[PDB]
């Protein structure tokens, strides 16, 4: 009942999910840029449009 707790805390470190290589691209908006920012924030919602 105790070795389990110690195994779990350690097991979190040893076992990790593969990481996602975030890529960067620059877009040159044609048209408005306020509307195409709002679009990319209601559609694909984790994109970090700056």
């Amino acid at each position: 009942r105790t070795s389990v707790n110690r195994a779990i805390i350690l097991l979190g470190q040893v076992d990790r999910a593969p990481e996602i290589p975030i890529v960067q691209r620059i877009y040159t908006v044609r048209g408005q840029a306020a509307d195409i920012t709002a679009l990319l924030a209601a559609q694909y919602p984790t994109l970090r449009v700056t």
């Binding site: 408005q32 306020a34 679009l39 559609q43």
Partner: protein
């Protein structure tokens, strides 16, 4: 909506999708046009001045 550009990105299951597109085909037509607030007529008088 894609801003105010008259486009509309709509995104759902295909059953809903082929139903909404059939409705929108029915109840969606361009607006009517105003007639005018001014008209002209030309009269070629024959007897009077």
């Amino acid at each position: 909506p894609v801003g105010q550009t008259g486009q509309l990105v709509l995104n759902g299951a295909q059953a809903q999708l082929d139903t909404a597109l059939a409705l929108l085909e029915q109840v969606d037509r361009p607006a009517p046009v105003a007639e005018s607030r001014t008209v002209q007529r030309v009269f070629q008088l024959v007897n009077a001045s």
